Design a protein around this ligand. Structure first.
Ligand code: EUO
Length: 108
């Protein structure tokens, strides 16, 4: 896989901001609050969120697009594992993952 260039990184920031602005992204914007989900961090061993990804983007943590996609997929995988399939939180992952794929393919 090809290294992420500085030109690549402008695109990644755009993709990330498109997701952060999505109406369904709210449960993913910041780390889960342990007060609203007291067992969350006993269940989910590798939490991830969009603020933690923004930090990594800004600090050029990602060297390959696959690593960026892997962090994003953890967000969605964590959500569907923690939540039952009829929860509104689960529905956020359904909507935002397919939005992400649309944007990812564009990033191309
Ligand atoms: C009850 N189920 C839930 C609850 C939450 C949650 C709760 C409070 C929160 N405060 C700041 C973020 C934040 C996220 N996130 C999910 S998630 C990431 O979609 O798996 N599922």
């Amino acid at each position: 896989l090809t290294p992420l260039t500085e030109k690549d990184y402008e695109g990644l920031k755009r993709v990330l901001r498109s997701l952060q602005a999505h109406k369904m992204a709210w449960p993913f914007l910041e780390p889960v609050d342990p007060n609203d989900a007291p067992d969350y961090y006993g269940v989910i061993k590798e939490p991830m969120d969009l603020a933690t990804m923004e930090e990594r983007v800004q600090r050029r943590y990602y060297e390959k697009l696959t690593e960026f996609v892997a962090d994003m997929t953890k967000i969605f995988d964590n959500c569907r594992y923690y939540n039952p399939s009829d929860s509104p939180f689960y529905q956020c992952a359904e909507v935002l993952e397919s939005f992400f794929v649309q944007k990812l393919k564009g990033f191309k």
